[PDB]
Amino acid sequence: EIVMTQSPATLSVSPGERATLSCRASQSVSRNLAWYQQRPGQAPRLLIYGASTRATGVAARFTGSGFGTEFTLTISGLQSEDFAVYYCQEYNNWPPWTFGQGTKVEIK
Amino acid sequence: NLCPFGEVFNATRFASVYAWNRKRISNCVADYSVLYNSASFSTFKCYGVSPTKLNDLCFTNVYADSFVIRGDEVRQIAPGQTGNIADYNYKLPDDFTGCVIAWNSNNLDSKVGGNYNYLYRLFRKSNLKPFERDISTEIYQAGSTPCNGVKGFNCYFPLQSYGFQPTYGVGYQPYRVVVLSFE
Amino acid sequence: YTNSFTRGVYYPDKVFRSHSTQDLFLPFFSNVTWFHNPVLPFNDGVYFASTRGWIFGTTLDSKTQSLLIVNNATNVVIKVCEFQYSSANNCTFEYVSQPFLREFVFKNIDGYFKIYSKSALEPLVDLPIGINITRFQTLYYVGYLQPRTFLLKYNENGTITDAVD
Amino acid sequence: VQLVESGGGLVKPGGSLRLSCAASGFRFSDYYMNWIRQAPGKGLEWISYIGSGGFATYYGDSVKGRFTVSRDDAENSLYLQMNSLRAEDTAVYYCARGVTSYSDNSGNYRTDDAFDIWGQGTMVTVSSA
Ligand SMILES: *[C@@H]1O[C@H](CO)[C@@H](O[C@@H]2O[C@H](CO)[C@@H](O[C@@H]3O[C@H](CO)[C@@H](O)[C@H](O)[C@@H]3O)[C@H](O)[C@H]2NC(C)=O)[C@H](O)[C@H]1NC(C)=O
C-alpha cells in the first residue's frame, strides 16, 4: 500500500509556457513509475515508463525525472492538444498498484 | 560516485529466469570489498579473477544478470555444466570471467499458498548459445504430428511454474542469483 | 576562402607548471580556410575559430561510432552513439557539463579526445572516447595541426605567453 | 496494435456479465494483460492482472472474490468474468497491455510493467431502473 499523492490542485498556465508536475510517493519505488495523459472523452495514453524513458509515439517536449520518492514531469511549449488530466501509477511489487489522483492543466 | 550495486542486489522483486534481466555498469568507482565480505551470500566462487584482488583492476564494462531459480538447481550456474537452466534458460561460456552470488530468499519470495510468478522454460529444439535469452512461447510439438498451436497431446506450453511455499525444504526454496560479467 | 594567422598554441598536452616540445601544433603563418558546412577531414587535429556544436567520426553512419557535441544555453552534451539523427543504438559514453572570439583545438590521440578553448589555449577537457576520427562537420576558420617542434615561454605563473617555431 | 472490446451493457444488481477483448497485430501469447477501470468522473483504478500463460492471476482489493480473469492465447482473445455484481462498480472498463520487456539502447534488459497501448471503453451501468 504505497499511497501516491500529486497535489498541484489545478495547474493554470497559458500556451507556450514550460510547466512542471509533481508526484510524491510515500515509500521508495525508485525506478517504477508511469505517466498517463487522458484527454477528456478519450482513452488514456502512456507517456513515460521507468520514470525517464519515453513511449513510442511521444514528442521530445515531454520529459520526466525522479528517483526514490520525488518524481517530476516537465512540459515545455504547450499546444492546444496538451490540456488534459495527468496520472502517475507505481508498480514496484506484485499486488495492488495505485494510480495517482490526477491533476488538470487549464488555459490561462 | 559509487555505481549502484544496491539497485541490483536489493531490488524489491527479481525477474524470473526465462527472461533474466541485465544491467550495464560503466563510469563508476565500484568496490567489491563490501560485496565479498558479507555473511548473507551463501555462495561466492569465481574464475580467473580471485575475489581478493577484485577492486585493484578496472574493466571497460561490467554486466549484472539477475534472476531467481530453485535452491538445488543453482549448481548449474557455472561454465561447463549442463542441465535445464544451463541448456535452455541461462548458459555461460567456457572462458567465463566475473562471478556469481546466490543468497537464500525464502522470507521474501515465497508466500503461503504459492508464488507462481517465477517461470522457467522446459522444452526447446536446440541448445542456447551463451548469453542468449528467448521469450517467444510458440507451442513445442513433442513429435512429428503438428497440432495447429493448441495446448494438448504431444504439444505443451514451454513455461511451467516453480510455485514456492515457505514450508518447502532447502532443496526447493528460492535462491536469488546475480552473475557479474567483466569486460 | 583562405587566410593566415599567428596563433594556435595550447598547453603541450601536459599539465606541468614551469621549454621545447615536439607535439602536434599549428604552423604560425599557415593557410587557414575561411568558411561561410561541408564535411572537412580531421587529419591529425583541427583548429576551429568563429566570431553551436560539432560532429566527428569516420563514416558518420550506423556502421561506426561517431562523436557528437551540442551546446545548449545552459549545458553541453557530449555523446558517442552510432548516429544516422534518425536512430541512436549502442550509446556508450555521455558527458554533461556547462556549455563551452571563440577558438578551439581538437586532437584525438591514444583513444583520448582532447579539447582546448579560449593566445595560450587552456585545456578545456579530454574525453576517453576511444574511437577513430577522420572527417568532421560543424553543427568559421578551420586549420590543421602539424607535428613540429615548438619553443614556449612560460611567464612565472604558467601562462604560455610567446612561442617560437 | 489494436485492442477492441465488447460485451458491455446494462445489468441489474446481483446479476452477472462477461466482458472480453480481442487483440490483433502482435504475438499475444508473450505479453501480460490486465484490466483498468474508471468510475464516471474519477481517477483510474486498477482491477485485474493475468500473466504469461495463466497461473499468475492477481486481483484488486474491492473485487477480490467476484471477478475471474482468464485468457485463451491461441484465439488471440481475452476474457474477464464478473459474478455477484453490485451497484457502485459502474465504470468504463479498459483492457490494457504491459510492456513485458524493454531492451534499452545498451544492455539494460529491464522488465517493465507499464500499461502501453490500451483499448476503447465499454460502459457498464448497474442500477435497478
Ligand atoms: C558498440 O560499438 C562498439 C564499437 O566502438 C562495439 O564494441 C566493440 O565490439 C567488438 C566486438 O566484440 C570488440 O572488438 C574486438 O573484439 C574481439 C573479439 O573477437 C577482440 O579479439 C578484439 O581484441 C577487440 O576487442 C570490442 O568489444 C569493441 N571494440 C571497440 C571498443 O571498438 C560494440 O560491438 C557495439 N555494440 C553493439 C550494439 O554491437
Side-chain angles (χ1 to χ4, degrees), chain D residues 8-36:
Chain D
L10 322 174
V11 309
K12 304 203 51 163
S16 63
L17 183 63
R18 188 171 187 273
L19 282 72
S20 70
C21 75
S24 64
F26 51 68
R27 297 175 173 175
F28 179 74
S29 183
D30 303 347
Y31 289 86
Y32 308 160
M33 301 265 298
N34 58 7
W35 292 77
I36 321 297

PDB file of all heavy atoms in Angstrom, chain D residues 8-36:
ATOM      1  N   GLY D   8     -19.964  -5.070 -23.111  1.00  0.00           N
ATOM      2  CA  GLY D   8     -20.506  -4.134 -22.150  1.00  0.00           C
ATOM      3  C   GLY D   8     -21.985  -3.893 -22.372  1.00  0.00           C
ATOM      4  O   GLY D   8     -22.489  -3.946 -23.492  1.00  0.00           O
ATOM      5  N   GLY D   9     -22.692  -3.616 -21.282  1.00  0.00           N
ATOM      6  CA  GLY D   9     -24.118  -3.385 -21.376  1.00  0.00           C
ATOM      7  C   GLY D   9     -24.745  -2.899 -20.090  1.00  0.00           C
ATOM      8  O   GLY D   9     -24.110  -2.182 -19.313  1.00  0.00           O
ATOM      9  N   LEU D  10     -26.000  -3.274 -19.861  1.00  0.00           N
ATOM     10  CA  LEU D  10     -26.730  -2.927 -18.651  1.00  0.00           C
ATOM     11  C   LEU D  10     -27.015  -4.205 -17.882  1.00  0.00           C
ATOM     12  O   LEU D  10     -27.464  -5.195 -18.468  1.00  0.00           O
ATOM     13  CB  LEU D  10     -28.049  -2.232 -18.986  1.00  0.00           C
ATOM     14  CG  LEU D  10     -28.036  -1.258 -20.162  1.00  0.00           C
ATOM     15  CD1 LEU D  10     -29.446  -0.772 -20.447  1.00  0.00           C
ATOM     16  CD2 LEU D  10     -27.100  -0.097 -19.922  1.00  0.00           C
ATOM     17  N   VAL D  11     -26.752  -4.197 -16.580  1.00  0.00           N
ATOM     18  CA  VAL D  11     -27.057  -5.349 -15.746  1.00  0.00           C
ATOM     19  C   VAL D  11     -27.817  -4.879 -14.519  1.00  0.00           C
ATOM     20  O   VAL D  11     -27.688  -3.732 -14.083  1.00  0.00           O
ATOM     21  CB  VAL D  11     -25.793  -6.127 -15.327  1.00  0.00           C
ATOM     22  CG1 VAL D  11     -24.930  -6.437 -16.535  1.00  0.00           C
ATOM     23  CG2 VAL D  11     -25.013  -5.352 -14.296  1.00  0.00           C
ATOM     24  N   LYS D  12     -28.622  -5.764 -13.977  1.00  0.00           N
ATOM     25  CA  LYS D  12     -29.335  -5.473 -12.750  1.00  0.00           C
ATOM     26  C   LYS D  12     -28.482  -5.855 -11.553  1.00  0.00           C
ATOM     27  O   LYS D  12     -27.564  -6.669 -11.673  1.00  0.00           O
ATOM     28  CB  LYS D  12     -30.660  -6.227 -12.724  1.00  0.00           C
ATOM     29  CG  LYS D  12     -31.543  -5.952 -13.928  1.00  0.00           C
ATOM     30  CD  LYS D  12     -33.003  -6.228 -13.621  1.00  0.00           C
ATOM     31  CE  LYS D  12     -33.439  -5.518 -12.350  1.00  0.00           C
ATOM     32  NZ  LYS D  12     -34.919  -5.426 -12.245  1.00  0.00           N
ATOM     33  N   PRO D  13     -28.732  -5.265 -10.387  1.00  0.00           N
ATOM     34  CA  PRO D  13     -27.952  -5.636  -9.204  1.00  0.00           C
ATOM     35  C   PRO D  13     -28.098  -7.116  -8.898  1.00  0.00           C
ATOM     36  O   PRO D  13     -29.177  -7.694  -9.036  1.00  0.00           O
ATOM     37  CB  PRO D  13     -28.556  -4.769  -8.095  1.00  0.00           C
ATOM     38  CG  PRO D  13     -29.128  -3.605  -8.809  1.00  0.00           C
ATOM     39  CD  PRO D  13     -29.637  -4.137 -10.115  1.00  0.00           C
ATOM     40  N   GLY D  14     -26.994  -7.731  -8.489  1.00  0.00           N
ATOM     41  CA  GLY D  14     -26.998  -9.142  -8.175  1.00  0.00           C
ATOM     42  C   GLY D  14     -26.914 -10.068  -9.364  1.00  0.00           C
ATOM     43  O   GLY D  14     -27.058 -11.282  -9.191  1.00  0.00           O
ATOM     44  N   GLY D  15     -26.692  -9.544 -10.560  1.00  0.00           N
ATOM     45  CA  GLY D  15     -26.582 -10.351 -11.759  1.00  0.00           C
ATOM     46  C   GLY D  15     -25.150 -10.721 -12.070  1.00  0.00           C
ATOM     47  O   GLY D  15     -24.300 -10.813 -11.181  1.00  0.00           O
ATOM     48  N   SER D  16     -24.879 -10.940 -13.353  1.00  0.00           N
ATOM     49  CA  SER D  16     -23.527 -11.239 -13.797  1.00  0.00           C
ATOM     50  C   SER D  16     -23.376 -10.830 -15.254  1.00  0.00           C
ATOM     51  O   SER D  16     -24.356 -10.705 -15.991  1.00  0.00           O
ATOM     52  CB  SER D  16     -23.192 -12.720 -13.612  1.00  0.00           C
ATOM     53  OG  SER D  16     -24.031 -13.533 -14.407  1.00  0.00           O
ATOM     54  N   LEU D  17     -22.127 -10.623 -15.659  1.00  0.00           N
ATOM     55  CA  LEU D  17     -21.809 -10.219 -17.021  1.00  0.00           C
ATOM     56  C   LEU D  17     -20.396 -10.687 -17.327  1.00  0.00           C
ATOM     57  O   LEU D  17     -19.602 -10.946 -16.419  1.00  0.00           O
ATOM     58  CB  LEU D  17     -21.952  -8.704 -17.198  1.00  0.00           C
ATOM     59  CG  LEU D  17     -21.719  -8.098 -18.583  1.00  0.00           C
ATOM     60  CD1 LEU D  17     -22.735  -8.628 -19.577  1.00  0.00           C
ATOM     61  CD2 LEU D  17     -21.778  -6.584 -18.520  1.00  0.00           C
ATOM     62  N   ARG D  18     -20.087 -10.803 -18.615  1.00  0.00           N
ATOM     63  CA  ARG D  18     -18.814 -11.373 -19.046  1.00  0.00           C
ATOM     64  C   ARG D  18     -18.232 -10.516 -20.158  1.00  0.00           C
ATOM     65  O   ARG D  18     -18.665 -10.618 -21.308  1.00  0.00           O
ATOM     66  CB  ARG D  18     -19.001 -12.810 -19.515  1.00  0.00           C
ATOM     67  CG  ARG D  18     -17.715 -13.542 -19.799  1.00  0.00           C
ATOM     68  CD  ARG D  18     -17.986 -15.007 -20.045  1.00  0.00           C
ATOM     69  NE  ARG D  18     -16.751 -15.765 -20.167  1.00  0.00           N
ATOM     70  CZ  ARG D  18     -16.086 -15.924 -21.302  1.00  0.00           C
ATOM     71  NH1 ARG D  18     -16.536 -15.373 -22.420  1.00  0.00           N
ATOM     72  NH2 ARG D  18     -14.970 -16.633 -21.318  1.00  0.00           N
ATOM     73  N   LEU D  19     -17.251  -9.688 -19.825  1.00  0.00           N
ATOM     74  CA  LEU D  19     -16.592  -8.846 -20.810  1.00  0.00           C
ATOM     75  C   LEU D  19     -15.468  -9.610 -21.487  1.00  0.00           C
ATOM     76  O   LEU D  19     -14.964 -10.607 -20.972  1.00  0.00           O
ATOM     77  CB  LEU D  19     -16.032  -7.577 -20.171  1.00  0.00           C
ATOM     78  CG  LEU D  19     -16.970  -6.422 -19.828  1.00  0.00           C
ATOM     79  CD1 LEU D  19     -17.855  -6.749 -18.654  1.00  0.00           C
ATOM     80  CD2 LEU D  19     -16.160  -5.181 -19.546  1.00  0.00           C
ATOM     81  N   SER D  20     -15.070  -9.119 -22.656  1.00  0.00           N
ATOM     82  CA  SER D  20     -13.977  -9.728 -23.398  1.00  0.00           C
ATOM     83  C   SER D  20     -13.376  -8.690 -24.330  1.00  0.00           C
ATOM     84  O   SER D  20     -14.052  -7.745 -24.737  1.00  0.00           O
ATOM     85  CB  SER D  20     -14.453 -10.944 -24.199  1.00  0.00           C
ATOM     86  OG  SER D  20     -15.281 -10.552 -25.276  1.00  0.00           O
ATOM     87  N   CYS D  21     -12.099  -8.873 -24.659  1.00  0.00           N
ATOM     88  CA  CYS D  21     -11.453  -8.042 -25.664  1.00  0.00           C
ATOM     89  C   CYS D  21     -10.502  -8.895 -26.480  1.00  0.00           C
ATOM     90  O   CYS D  21      -9.746  -9.692 -25.923  1.00  0.00           O
ATOM     91  CB  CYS D  21     -10.711  -6.850 -25.040  1.00  0.00           C
ATOM     92  SG  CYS D  21      -9.130  -7.112 -24.185  1.00  0.00           S
ATOM     93  N   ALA D  22     -10.554  -8.728 -27.796  1.00  0.00           N
ATOM     94  CA  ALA D  22      -9.720  -9.470 -28.728  1.00  0.00           C
ATOM     95  C   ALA D  22      -8.656  -8.550 -29.306  1.00  0.00           C
ATOM     96  O   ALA D  22      -8.940  -7.405 -29.667  1.00  0.00           O
ATOM     97  CB  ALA D  22     -10.559 -10.071 -29.857  1.00  0.00           C
ATOM     98  N   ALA D  23      -7.433  -9.053 -29.394  1.00  0.00           N
ATOM     99  CA  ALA D  23      -6.299  -8.262 -29.836  1.00  0.00           C
ATOM    100  C   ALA D  23      -5.727  -8.835 -31.122  1.00  0.00           C
ATOM    101  O   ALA D  23      -5.803 -10.041 -31.375  1.00  0.00           O
ATOM    102  CB  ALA D  23      -5.212  -8.217 -28.764  1.00  0.00           C
ATOM    103  N   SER D  24      -5.152  -7.955 -31.936  1.00  0.00           N
ATOM    104  CA  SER D  24      -4.507  -8.368 -33.172  1.00  0.00           C
ATOM    105  C   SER D  24      -3.336  -7.443 -33.454  1.00  0.00           C
ATOM    106  O   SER D  24      -3.316  -6.291 -33.016  1.00  0.00           O
ATOM    107  CB  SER D  24      -5.487  -8.358 -34.349  1.00  0.00           C
ATOM    108  OG  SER D  24      -5.949  -7.046 -34.614  1.00  0.00           O
ATOM    109  N   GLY D  25      -2.366  -7.956 -34.200  1.00  0.00           N
ATOM    110  CA  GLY D  25      -1.204  -7.185 -34.577  1.00  0.00           C
ATOM    111  C   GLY D  25       0.065  -7.482 -33.812  1.00  0.00           C
ATOM    112  O   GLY D  25       1.064  -6.788 -34.027  1.00  0.00           O
ATOM    113  N   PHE D  26       0.064  -8.477 -32.931  1.00  0.00           N
ATOM    114  CA  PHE D  26       1.274  -8.851 -32.212  1.00  0.00           C
ATOM    115  C   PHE D  26       1.147 -10.294 -31.752  1.00  0.00           C
ATOM    116  O   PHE D  26       0.080 -10.905 -31.841  1.00  0.00           O
ATOM    117  CB  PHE D  26       1.544  -7.919 -31.023  1.00  0.00           C
ATOM    118  CG  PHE D  26       0.366  -7.734 -30.101  1.00  0.00           C
ATOM    119  CD1 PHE D  26      -0.102  -8.774 -29.322  1.00  0.00           C
ATOM    120  CD2 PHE D  26      -0.249  -6.506 -29.987  1.00  0.00           C
ATOM    121  CE1 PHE D  26      -1.170  -8.595 -28.477  1.00  0.00           C
ATOM    122  CE2 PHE D  26      -1.313  -6.327 -29.139  1.00  0.00           C
ATOM    123  CZ  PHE D  26      -1.772  -7.371 -28.386  1.00  0.00           C
ATOM    124  N   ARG D  27       2.256 -10.832 -31.255  1.00  0.00           N
ATOM    125  CA  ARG D  27       2.238 -12.137 -30.601  1.00  0.00           C
ATOM    126  C   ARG D  27       1.559 -11.968 -29.253  1.00  0.00           C
ATOM    127  O   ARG D  27       2.153 -11.456 -28.304  1.00  0.00           O
ATOM    128  CB  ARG D  27       3.650 -12.684 -30.438  1.00  0.00           C
ATOM    129  CG  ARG D  27       4.380 -12.950 -31.733  1.00  0.00           C
ATOM    130  CD  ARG D  27       5.808 -13.379 -31.456  1.00  0.00           C
ATOM    131  NE  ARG D  27       6.503 -13.810 -32.665  1.00  0.00           N
ATOM    132  CZ  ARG D  27       7.791 -14.138 -32.710  1.00  0.00           C
ATOM    133  NH1 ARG D  27       8.533 -14.086 -31.612  1.00  0.00           N
ATOM    134  NH2 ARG D  27       8.339 -14.520 -33.855  1.00  0.00           N
ATOM    135  N   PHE D  28       0.300 -12.388 -29.161  1.00  0.00           N
ATOM    136  CA  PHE D  28      -0.454 -12.148 -27.942  1.00  0.00           C
ATOM    137  C   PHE D  28      -0.010 -13.032 -26.793  1.00  0.00           C
ATOM    138  O   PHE D  28      -0.258 -12.687 -25.636  1.00  0.00           O
ATOM    139  CB  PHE D  28      -1.939 -12.358 -28.194  1.00  0.00           C
ATOM    140  CG  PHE D  28      -2.788 -12.162 -26.986  1.00  0.00           C
ATOM    141  CD1 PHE D  28      -3.031 -10.900 -26.500  1.00  0.00           C
ATOM    142  CD2 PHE D  28      -3.348 -13.240 -26.342  1.00  0.00           C
ATOM    143  CE1 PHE D  28      -3.813 -10.719 -25.396  1.00  0.00           C
ATOM    144  CE2 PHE D  28      -4.134 -13.062 -25.238  1.00  0.00           C
ATOM    145  CZ  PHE D  28      -4.368 -11.801 -24.765  1.00  0.00           C
ATOM    146  N   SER D  29       0.646 -14.149 -27.072  1.00  0.00           N
ATOM    147  CA  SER D  29       0.936 -15.111 -26.020  1.00  0.00           C
ATOM    148  C   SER D  29       2.203 -14.799 -25.244  1.00  0.00           C
ATOM    149  O   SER D  29       2.625 -15.630 -24.439  1.00  0.00           O
ATOM    150  CB  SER D  29       1.045 -16.515 -26.604  1.00  0.00           C
ATOM    151  OG  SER D  29       1.267 -17.454 -25.571  1.00  0.00           O
ATOM    152  N   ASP D  30       2.826 -13.645 -25.466  1.00  0.00           N
ATOM    153  CA  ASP D  30       4.073 -13.306 -24.792  1.00  0.00           C
ATOM    154  C   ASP D  30       3.958 -12.079 -23.903  1.00  0.00           C
ATOM    155  O   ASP D  30       4.969 -11.642 -23.344  1.00  0.00           O
ATOM    156  CB  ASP D  30       5.189 -13.083 -25.813  1.00  0.00           C
ATOM    157  CG  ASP D  30       5.410 -14.280 -26.704  1.00  0.00           C
ATOM    158  OD1 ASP D  30       4.882 -15.364 -26.386  1.00  0.00           O
ATOM    159  OD2 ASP D  30       6.126 -14.140 -27.715  1.00  0.00           O
ATOM    160  N   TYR D  31       2.769 -11.511 -23.750  1.00  0.00           N
ATOM    161  CA  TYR D  31       2.608 -10.243 -23.059  1.00  0.00           C
ATOM    162  C   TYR D  31       1.665 -10.394 -21.879  1.00  0.00           C
ATOM    163  O   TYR D  31       0.699 -11.159 -21.936  1.00  0.00           O
ATOM    164  CB  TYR D  31       2.082  -9.173 -24.009  1.00  0.00           C
ATOM    165  CG  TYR D  31       3.091  -8.733 -25.034  1.00  0.00           C
ATOM    166  CD1 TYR D  31       3.243  -9.422 -26.222  1.00  0.00           C
ATOM    167  CD2 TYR D  31       3.898  -7.632 -24.811  1.00  0.00           C
ATOM    168  CE1 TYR D  31       4.166  -9.025 -27.158  1.00  0.00           C
ATOM    169  CE2 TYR D  31       4.825  -7.228 -25.741  1.00  0.00           C
ATOM    170  CZ  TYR D  31       4.954  -7.928 -26.913  1.00  0.00           C
ATOM    171  OH  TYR D  31       5.876  -7.530 -27.845  1.00  0.00           O
ATOM    172  N   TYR D  32       1.958  -9.667 -20.806  1.00  0.00           N
ATOM    173  CA  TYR D  32       0.999  -9.530 -19.727  1.00  0.00           C
ATOM    174  C   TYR D  32      -0.212  -8.771 -20.234  1.00  0.00           C
ATOM    175  O   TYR D  32      -0.115  -7.956 -21.149  1.00  0.00           O
ATOM    176  CB  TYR D  32       1.598  -8.770 -18.548  1.00  0.00           C
ATOM    177  CG  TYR D  32       2.920  -9.272 -18.027  1.00  0.00           C
ATOM    178  CD1 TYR D  32       3.733  -8.449 -17.274  1.00  0.00           C
ATOM    179  CD2 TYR D  32       3.350 -10.563 -18.270  1.00  0.00           C
ATOM    180  CE1 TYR D  32       4.935  -8.886 -16.786  1.00  0.00           C
ATOM    181  CE2 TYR D  32       4.557 -11.011 -17.783  1.00  0.00           C
ATOM    182  CZ  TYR D  32       5.344 -10.166 -17.042  1.00  0.00           C
ATOM    183  OH  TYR D  32       6.548 -10.601 -16.553  1.00  0.00           O
ATOM    184  N   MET D  33      -1.366  -9.041 -19.640  1.00  0.00           N
ATOM    185  CA  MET D  33      -2.548  -8.243 -19.915  1.00  0.00           C
ATOM    186  C   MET D  33      -3.301  -8.047 -18.615  1.00  0.00           C
ATOM    187  O   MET D  33      -3.164  -8.835 -17.681  1.00  0.00           O
ATOM    188  CB  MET D  33      -3.461  -8.887 -20.956  1.00  0.00           C
ATOM    189  CG  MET D  33      -2.819  -9.143 -22.296  1.00  0.00           C
ATOM    190  SD  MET D  33      -3.116  -7.810 -23.457  1.00  0.00           S
ATOM    191  CE  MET D  33      -4.892  -7.893 -23.568  1.00  0.00           C
ATOM    192  N   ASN D  34      -4.113  -6.998 -18.565  1.00  0.00           N
ATOM    193  CA  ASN D  34      -4.740  -6.619 -17.310  1.00  0.00           C
ATOM    194  C   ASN D  34      -5.720  -5.483 -17.522  1.00  0.00           C
ATOM    195  O   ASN D  34      -5.577  -4.701 -18.460  1.00  0.00           O
ATOM    196  CB  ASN D  34      -3.663  -6.275 -16.285  1.00  0.00           C
ATOM    197  CG  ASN D  34      -2.763  -5.185 -16.747  1.00  0.00           C
ATOM    198  OD1 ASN D  34      -2.995  -4.571 -17.774  1.00  0.00           O
ATOM    199  ND2 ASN D  34      -1.666  -4.996 -16.035  1.00  0.00           N
ATOM    200  N   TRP D  35      -6.719  -5.408 -16.644  1.00  0.00           N
ATOM    201  CA  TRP D  35      -7.897  -4.570 -16.838  1.00  0.00           C
ATOM    202  C   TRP D  35      -7.865  -3.361 -15.917  1.00  0.00           C
ATOM    203  O   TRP D  35      -7.844  -3.512 -14.694  1.00  0.00           O
ATOM    204  CB  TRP D  35      -9.175  -5.359 -16.575  1.00  0.00           C
ATOM    205  CG  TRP D  35      -9.444  -6.412 -17.562  1.00  0.00           C
ATOM    206  CD1 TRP D  35      -8.847  -7.618 -17.636  1.00  0.00           C
ATOM    207  CD2 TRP D  35     -10.392  -6.363 -18.628  1.00  0.00           C
ATOM    208  NE1 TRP D  35      -9.358  -8.333 -18.681  1.00  0.00           N
ATOM    209  CE2 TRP D  35     -10.307  -7.576 -19.312  1.00  0.00           C
ATOM    210  CE3 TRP D  35     -11.300  -5.406 -19.074  1.00  0.00           C
ATOM    211  CZ2 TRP D  35     -11.091  -7.863 -20.412  1.00  0.00           C
ATOM    212  CZ3 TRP D  35     -12.074  -5.690 -20.165  1.00  0.00           C
ATOM    213  CH2 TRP D  35     -11.970  -6.905 -20.822  1.00  0.00           C
ATOM    214  N   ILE D  36      -7.928  -2.175 -16.502  1.00  0.00           N
ATOM    215  CA  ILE D  36      -8.113  -0.953 -15.760  1.00  0.00           C
ATOM    216  C   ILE D  36      -9.606  -0.653 -15.731  1.00  0.00           C
ATOM    217  O   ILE D  36     -10.397  -1.277 -16.427  1.00  0.00           O
ATOM    218  CB  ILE D  36      -7.319   0.210 -16.378  1.00  0.00           C
ATOM    219  CG1 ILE D  36      -5.975  -0.282 -16.869  1.00  0.00           C
ATOM    220  CG2 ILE D  36      -7.075   1.272 -15.370  1.00  0.00           C
ATOM    221  CD1 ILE D  36      -5.113  -0.789 -15.776  1.00  0.00           C
TER     222      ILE D  36
END
